[PDB]
RNA sequence: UGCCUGGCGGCCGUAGCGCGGUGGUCCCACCUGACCCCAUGCCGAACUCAGAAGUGAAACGCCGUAGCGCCGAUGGUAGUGUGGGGUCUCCCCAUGCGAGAGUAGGGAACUGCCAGGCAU
RNA sequence: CCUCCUAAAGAGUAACGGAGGAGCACGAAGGUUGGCUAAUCCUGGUCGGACAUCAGGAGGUUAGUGCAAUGGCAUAAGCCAGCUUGACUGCGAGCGUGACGGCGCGAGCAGGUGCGAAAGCAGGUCAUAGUGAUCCGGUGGUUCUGAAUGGAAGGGCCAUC
RNA sequence: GCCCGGAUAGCUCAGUCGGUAGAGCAGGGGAUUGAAAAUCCCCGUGUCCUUGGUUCGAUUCCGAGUCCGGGCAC
RNA sequence: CGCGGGGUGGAGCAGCCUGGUAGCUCGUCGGGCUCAUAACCCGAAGAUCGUCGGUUCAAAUCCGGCCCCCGCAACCA
């Protein structure tokens, strides 16, 4: 709801008067974001990444795609073509109503704050969230016991410089321990 | 963006093949606000007759100028046109598009109009 | 004779006397084989049968 | 003795040694030794040559090789019959032309350098001149 | 003594089979035009030289003589045949 | 007539790349919406459809700039035909042919077609 | 039997000359429509922080190619998806190629078909290795014949072992 | 490429005329001795190979094909 | 010369056939029984597969070079 709202009115003017943009429009918006796990754990038992989708598409907002291997060698000599990851990849409405899970319950849930101490961005304006655990659940009894696994948050603009990238996102408020 | 520079690969496999079979070509552009047609000479020479929605003579009377109606309007005359000129044995190019919504009504109403591929 | 995929006969499924000839890795899959080719006898296309069996 | 390090392949066709060799100007150093009559060398040479300006100059100066020998040459076995395939490999040489520039030093003086030659030189397998760098 | 300097792994030898005839300024109807095998690169094709086996002849494909072209972006060569 | 924008070319690096400037109620991109036919091995990113305001930002066209890519004489040099010589592992002589590299210099494109706008 | 060099800028031509492989695979790894683009490194990244999966950038194929090397390819001959059986039967001008046997190549025509809106495409695999003359004998088809007439062993043709 | 004949406890065999899953030895625990060699004990495992079929129900009874072992073929 | 086999924990042997897997008996070290040692019992440790490269996602294994050990061969007048 109110995220893609609020970037509309504030986040757009904020970084335009900061900035002095040339045109209005070129102020940084947000690019898909994409979520995944990767493998978690244990590619041999070969049922854990199934279930690793059914956890992950609760809080994703749409089934995971299960992304298998490209030519591998790294933890185990996987090979190539074996399923491995997860991946997700969100936009618009979906990724603003995610984005809002983000930051409103998310965040404020991780206890010793892991998820963000000063964390840095890629080389151009591109930033990803590692959260440890998790998170919360959509109506009601969320915790079944299960069997942990974090997973990246790498959220993605349109922007020239990390500098300038970390005032966008920044503008809709970024983290208590950062 | 980036889809200029994939439009133009998927289009040159199809029109190789007719300019290098000697085949008329009936080539078609979209763009979101304007559809074009030629019929090309079969060597590259002269653009034998066309039909865009930015001639007049189609673009008053149409709601859009970008849409699957003003697509038919561009078929239409465009056909017509070609026979007078006495063409027909001509060939299709997608151009880089697919063969789906305004391409599509106006590859029909082409043929419907008259022209005899 | 040749590797160990070896030679089938496909035989036609109308009671015209023909057949192809092709090899097929019966371990592999041994699925035996459906398929649709020309019966010149017939002068047809037809589905072809089998895999040298009874 | 130098050797390539590793190469493509281990045997390889006598060949011609027929032209005129790139190297026909002193460059890095100041001035050098070139080969004047053409011939092979067989990398021990250009060995007791590096060892022989290195007796005379000393702790003074930096000595330059231009050439390296890498063309492998074969040799037959001792008392076997002709023509069981090809050869051994046992040496390896560089093929000087005319005027190749073999060794070059600088950070020396003139008289000494002229004389570090003769001692190299009569080392070497062709008949050699010293040679100065030169503005154009 | 007869000493023995032993076998090898030798060559096998070659074959023979790499190209064997291209023709030139002709006038029949599908000559093999240029038998460069191996290839769709070496030469390519055009006009009423499309032949273009599946092993990549490129075979006159009506009556003429070979022009030659090197032809647009990436300077491939193409034969392609004046009609006779 | 000219200038500018788009499609199809011809020639296919002197045509490219970099760097800087620059253009948007013709047009073109981006653009918003996804209803609907359509569509994603998840993803309206792509594909497709339906379209107003917005922006010239990125793309791209245009211009300037030689930093780079690139073209490149003449003369000499190598090589070779034929004929001849010799100190013959190779080089000379007669005369025909004559590079590659490198130097001067050129260099930021020329041009046909139909299609729209603006000025005349 | 294939590929590179020797091989002399058309034919590619020897030597117990230099260097490598093949004796198959494939019912999709074939057809066709449609889409897409590589190794590698860096930077950010919940434990593979030497190497999974992810995102961004540089690069511009340095990759791919069922298997060897050479040629090849972005309109992809690479990678993926959908429908499928043209891995068709009859021929076949014209030809490269070889002493001959033989081997290669193929527009087009006739039948019937698959894919695609259509043009068009398709007669195996991007090409060159993956082989076996003839006799003899086997299985199935074929009025063609079948030693007095009629039938039949048998023989022939065709498919194939 | 035929006719044969087998395909189970880990093994060989077999209670298995279709109404119904075992002997001999193999690994663990208990019970005794200069531990042991060696007594005695209680568990050891099978949709009888994959598919057809008779039938009130049947693996085996009647059948088609894969693999092993034995003959005659060429 | 030449051909083929071999190079494993401190010892002797196994695994080596397009491959991912380290096993046995001795010896060793720690604990135990015994007056004490022997033996006997229990536990543990020990090989980055001669060496260098190559092919491979992966190599002790397959491939190539060198050193080292063994078997056979190195004649015919």
Redesign the interface.
């Known amino acids: 709801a109110k995220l893609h709202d609020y970037y509309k009115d504030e986040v757009v003017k904020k970084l335009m008067t900061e900035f002095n943009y040339n045109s209005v429009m070129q102020v940084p918006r947000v690019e898909k974001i994409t979520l995944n796990m990767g493998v978690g754990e244990a590619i041999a038992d070969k049922k854990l990444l199934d279930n690793a989708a059914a956890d992950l598409a609760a809080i994703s907002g749409q089934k995971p795609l299960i992304t298998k291997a490209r030519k591998s060698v790294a933890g185990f000599k996987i090979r190539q073509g074996y399923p491995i990851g997860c991946k997700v990849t969100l936009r618009g409405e979906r990724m603003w109503e995610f984005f809002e899970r983000l930051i409103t319950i998310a965040v404020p849930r991780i206890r010793d704050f892991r998820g963000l101490s000063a964390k840095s961005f890629d080389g151009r304006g591109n930033y990803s969230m590692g959260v440890r655990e998790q998170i919360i659940f959509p109506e009601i009894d969320y915790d079944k016991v299960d069997r942990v696994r974090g997973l990246d948050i790498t959220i993605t603009t349109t922007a020239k410089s990390d500098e300038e990238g970390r005032a966008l996102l920044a503008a809709f408020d970024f983290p208590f321990r950062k | 963006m980036d889809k200029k520079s994939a439009r133009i690969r998927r289009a040159t496999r199809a029109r190789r093949k007719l300019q290098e079979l000697g085949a008329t070509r009936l080539v078609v552009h979209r763009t979101p606000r304007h559809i074009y047609a030629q019929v090309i000479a079969p060597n590259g020479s002269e653009v034998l007759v066309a039909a865009s929605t930015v001639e007049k003579a189609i673009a008053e009377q149409l709601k859009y100028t970008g849409n699957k109606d003003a697509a038919a309007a561009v078929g239409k005359a465009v056909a017509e046109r070609a026979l007078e000129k006495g063409i027909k044995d001509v060939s299709f190019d997608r151009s880089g598009f697919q063969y789906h919504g305004r391409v599509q009504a106006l590859a029909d109403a082409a043929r419907e109009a008259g022209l005899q591929f | 004779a040749k590797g160990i995929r070896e030679k089938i006969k496909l035989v036609s499924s109308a009671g015209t006397g023909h057949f192809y000839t092709t090899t097929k890795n019966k371990r592999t899959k041994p699925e035996k084989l459906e398929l649709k080719k020309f019966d010149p006898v017939v002068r047809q296309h037809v589905i072809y049968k089998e895999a040298k069996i009874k | 003795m130098l050797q390539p390090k590793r190469t493509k392949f281990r045997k390889m066709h006598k060949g011609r040694n027929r032209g005129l060799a790139q190297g026909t100007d002193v460059s890095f150093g100041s001035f050098g030794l070139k080969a004047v009559g053409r011939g092979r060398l067989t990398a021990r040479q250009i060995e007791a040559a590096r060892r022989a300006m290195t007796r005379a100059v000393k702790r003074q100066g930096k000595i330059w090789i231009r050439v390296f020998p890498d063309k492998p040459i074969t040799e037959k076995p001792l008392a076997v019959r002709m023509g069981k395939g090809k050869g051994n490999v046992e040496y390896w040489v560089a093929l000087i032309q005319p005027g190749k520039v073999l060794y070059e030093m600088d950070g020396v003086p003139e008289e000494l350098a002229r004389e570090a030659f003769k001692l190299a030189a009569a080392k070497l397998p062709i008949k050699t001149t010293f040679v100065t760098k030169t503005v154009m | 003594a007869?000493?023995?300097?032993?076998?090898?792994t030798?060559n096998g030898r070659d074959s023979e089979a790499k190209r064997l005839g291209v023709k030139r300024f002709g006038g029949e109807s599908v000559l093999a035009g240029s038998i460069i095998v191996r290839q769709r690169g070496t030469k390519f094709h055009?006009g009423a030289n499309?032949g273009c086996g599946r092993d990549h002849t490129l075979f006159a494909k009506a009556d003429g003589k070979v022009k030659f072209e090197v032809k647009g972006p990436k300077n491939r060569k193409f034969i392609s045949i004046e009609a006779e």
């Open positions: 007869h000493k023995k300097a032993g076998g090898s030798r055009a499309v």
